Amino acid sequence: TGRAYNLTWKSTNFKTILEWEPKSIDHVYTVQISTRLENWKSKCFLTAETECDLTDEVVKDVGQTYMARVLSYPARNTTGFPEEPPFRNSPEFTPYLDTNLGQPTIQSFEQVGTKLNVTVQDARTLVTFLSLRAVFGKDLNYTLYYWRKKTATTNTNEFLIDVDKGENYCFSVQAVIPSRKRKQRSPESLTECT
Template structure:
């Protein structure tokens, strides 16, 4: 995956049950999946999410899976969390003995979630201007009215976007940056251009650059050439 991969194991409690290893956080646009190994046989896993200031939350209780969606346990995205993967039998959950567990590395969603692909909604090349309109990726978190928050709603001024563009069939790439949802750049009106967009968090030390959008290309140059060819064809036809 293209996300933060964090490995760590700590063993506590009764060691008679196997404990999880290779614990990883996988997070894109704040949707966060915890993964680990091995597949259990004769026992279960229960995930505990420990925050610095929030209460401990239990997720995927008595699961035989080796992954767990912990997104809704990380709503305070600037808080730092640690996951405990408990190895349990169904009866052990009811007594006071601490089950063996493995602990993940620390994870801070705001600093470590990967920015997903922006969605390009519209683009036009008219004359010497290329205009591109795009949309922020959405997160799993919602406003009180039920609508989904975008990554811009969470990152606000920490978020910017970069447009990379180049003449079709050329290797010379240029880029421009914006904090809005649109780009307007000057181009050669007779050439086609290809481009893509990428979200960026400049303040980050790691995972600064997000996933790249789909590469799209304009077709204005082809239309001009096609029009000239069509006009030439019509003139030649009339000549006969």
């Protein structure tokens, strides 16, 4: 037939890509997206690649549920009765729930005697750009892991806990959206020590 299989979504911080199989020299692929509000619309036209970046379409509204499909077309006019293009529908995808949280980044830190202070860099995504805080608001929290492992939490991008001067601390941060049932946490960031 020529139909694609293994249609899977790859998304982290709203940067979204559809991937599939098989890699072919015999066929090219056309990719379409749709919602319950909008009919199929082509984004990738006759490509030989096996992935398509759909970030700009899903960000129109990250609260909607989307579906994509891969249409296959011969690459190398065989009859005067051309067949209907074979297609494969992808699984459903709801951006705000399904995208993975990306590894955070400690943009700054310092210990003011008995005051340890850490600042998390503001996560964005190259689309304009789309900010994590601009989407999630109060739903996005951060956890701080620290040893000389205890854990602090915050609703903003700033941490300020108490430490004993002279002491040396090591810590790492992690993004968390507690209202999620799965995909609640991101990987821990690189560790930093005072």
